[PDB]
Design a binder for this molecule. Structure first.
Ligand SMILES: C[As](C)(=O)[O-]
Ligand SMILES: C[As](C)(=O)[O-]
Ligand code: NA
Lengths: 400, 410
């Protein structure tokens, strides 16, 4: 009965389990992990610190830990079709940083989308590309022309708010045309890569990185993939001892569990439902005349909506929707005119509601509420009614 | 019944539980966390991503997370007597990075306790646009006493002119005088940082003088002697420094924090505020000193500095086996894990070393007392004396099993 020793803490945990149950989570980077992933991170593997890699540990006592890590490695390789995997990065940003350390020098130019900078932002010269102004799509010819001016040593593809399929073969063609490495950060789409709904970057990127959380639905953490053995060896040294000490083996256990879950046929259905639910919500905004969806829609788990014909800015929209138990985030839109603190947009995502079992009917309802709530932002008695309706829905879809 | 879905992973967890049961853990940085700490880490807090600090988050949905994180902050402040605490650093190396970014500039000179007197091993040093990190200049212990000589450290600091002096060690066995370190830093115009990661649990238990009133910034891991989850913590009494630290940690180094791990930090911090934690710290101190005594008395082994006042010590094994690496492999044959380790003025190559490092926290957390600790060190002596005799190693291994069986891990 450990909970009796510390009630303030353990009651706050029940309060969060309750809050999550009454919230509609549309933050596009969020998800809902399995009990098995949680339990894996809650094991006594946290007691064992195991510097180095399997079969090449500094300290002894690591034969079992080597089995666990090898499982995560093999499942990652299998799931994403790569020859080399490193499951030790503590986060997606550590994973990226290792790639920078292994391929380019301090001071080199890196081009990336809509700026994957994190703590590396002062070590390298990051230069941003985004989308064409009219189509709001990637324009590979403009990106090539930009890369010919800037001459990056490394190009990064991947973004946290682009709704459309990325053509990784074209990124690699661009990279090869100016002699740059390609890295892809698939953090946001990794689960859709794993489900088959997004084309894989693995055959085209020199190195691919990802978080294990987000669409892949695992624990917080990183992963790096490559087909090139000389690069693998640099990556492994950059992660340890370059950036990190010993790995979090209990989190690696949880990566294993999540990777197995993503190898299951059922994960393909989840990814289909993610695609469908996002599409359904985007359709509600597309139909309405006072909301515009960026690029006109989505082929992935998210979209951006320009809300400025109905409320002043994306920050206001986020606050209003919090009133009705719906969380999401404000988000700059392409060629954003407003202030980075205000923005003209919101970003809406489907993975978390999909993981609690909601389908297209529910998704469409949720977006009706959003429209309604936003249209009546100044009418607290309306907000309260939507809130009541939201509660009926959350009650019908238990979180665990 | 999730384990039925993945027996290969879940059978491996069971095997590691049993392996820990059968092992005597003497790695000085290891410990055994409570069931509550593990459970906390294994909560649904992992689903909530909350950039910013409590009451100042970017996204909504963060009211309960704020309570959890404020609990950790308040407990850390209360346990360590600090005016400001940041519990978001994902690791001890990050907490250290934040400190460097907040107080000094790339290329500045930093004096720190060398990698063998008993010093750390800097992972993730932040890198400038021109490729500079910091000019690390190390100080040592005195060659004859193997103690810190504060006059020689002052004299060095006057020649070298560091901007930052770092104190704290992964292998020094004696009490550090943090007031003197502060005095030396003030004398040459440097900041003092203390990385208390190894001794934090002893700081918390009253058994090691606190650095907190003397360091401009104190860092630690939440694991090791403090016996919590993997992660970091930064303490300061200066509000202007606190503000820089907080920005360096987020968005400078990290995104959003690991709120489930922060929950586990709150758990551990409360365990450590408990009066029983002071008994744990006493036992830690006693168990280490009992092991060191076996080595002191034996004529073919020498304890660095002649003994210990904390959780660990080093032994020169070179009269008995060729190097610390051999010693480490030999002991593994008997179900005892420790690490090789350089000793002050080490003559052997860093991959061999003259020494082993032994620690008491993990045996203490299993309930072992002085008699057990003494028995363990006699076994090590014997194992090492008979390194080339597998029948003797086998027999010691069988006696280790009787002990481990009598002191269940969980
Ligand atoms: C800034 As994010 C982790 O919500 O894409
Ligand atoms: C570098 As260590 C965590 O074994 O003292
Ligand atoms: Na529309």
């Amino acid at each position: 009965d450990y909970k009796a020793f510390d009630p303030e803490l353990w009651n706050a945990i029940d309060a969060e389990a309750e809050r999550q149950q009454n919230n509609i989570e549309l933050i596009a980077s969020e998800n809902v992990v399995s009990k098995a992933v949680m339990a894996a991170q809650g094991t006594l593997l946290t007691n064992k610190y195991a510097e180095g890699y399997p079969g090449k540990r500094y300290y002894g006592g690591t034969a079992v830990i080597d089995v666990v890590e090898t499982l995560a490695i093999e499942r990652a390789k299998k799931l994403f079709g790569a020859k080399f995997a490193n499951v030790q990065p503590h986060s997606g940003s550590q994973a990226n940083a290792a790639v920078y350390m292994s391929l380019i020098q301090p001071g080199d130019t890196v081009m990336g989308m809509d700026l994957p900078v994190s703590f590396s932002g002062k070590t390298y010269n990051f230069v941003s590309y985004n989308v064409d102004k009219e189509s709001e799509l990637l324009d590979y010819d403009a990106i090539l022309a930009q890369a010919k001016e800037v001459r990056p040593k490394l190009i990064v593809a991947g973004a946290s708010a682009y709704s459309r399929i990325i053509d990784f073969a074209k990124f690699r063609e661009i990279a090869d045309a100016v002699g740059a490495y390609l890295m892809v950060d698939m953090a946001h789409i990794a689960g859709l890569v794993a489900s088959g709904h997004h084309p894989s970057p693995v055959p085209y990127a020199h190195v691919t990185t990802t978080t294990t959380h987000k669409t892949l639905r695992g624990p917080r953490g990183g992963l790096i993939l490559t087909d090139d053995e000389d690069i693998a060896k640099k990556l492994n040294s950059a992660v340890f001892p370059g950036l990190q000490g010993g790995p979090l083996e209990h989190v690696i256990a949880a990566k294993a569990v999540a990777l197995k879950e993503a190898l299951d046929p059922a994960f393909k259905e989840y990814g289909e439902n993610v695609i469908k639910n996002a599409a359904a919500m985007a359709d509600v905004f597309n139909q309405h005349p006072d909301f515009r969806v960026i690029s006109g829609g989505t082929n992935n788990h998210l979209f951006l909506v320009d809300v400025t014909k109905v409320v002043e800015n994306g920050k206001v929209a986020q606050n209003v929707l919090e009133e009705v138990n719906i969380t999401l985030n404000k988000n700059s839109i392409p060629y954003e005119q407003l202030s980075p603190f205000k923005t003209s947009g919101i970003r809406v995502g489907s993975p978390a509601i999909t993981s609690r079992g909601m389908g297209e009917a529910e998704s469409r309802q949720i977006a009706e509420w959003m429209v309604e709530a936003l249209e009546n932002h100044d009418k607290p008695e309306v907000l309260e009614r939507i809130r009541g309706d939201v509660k009926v829905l959350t009650d019908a879809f238990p979180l665990y």
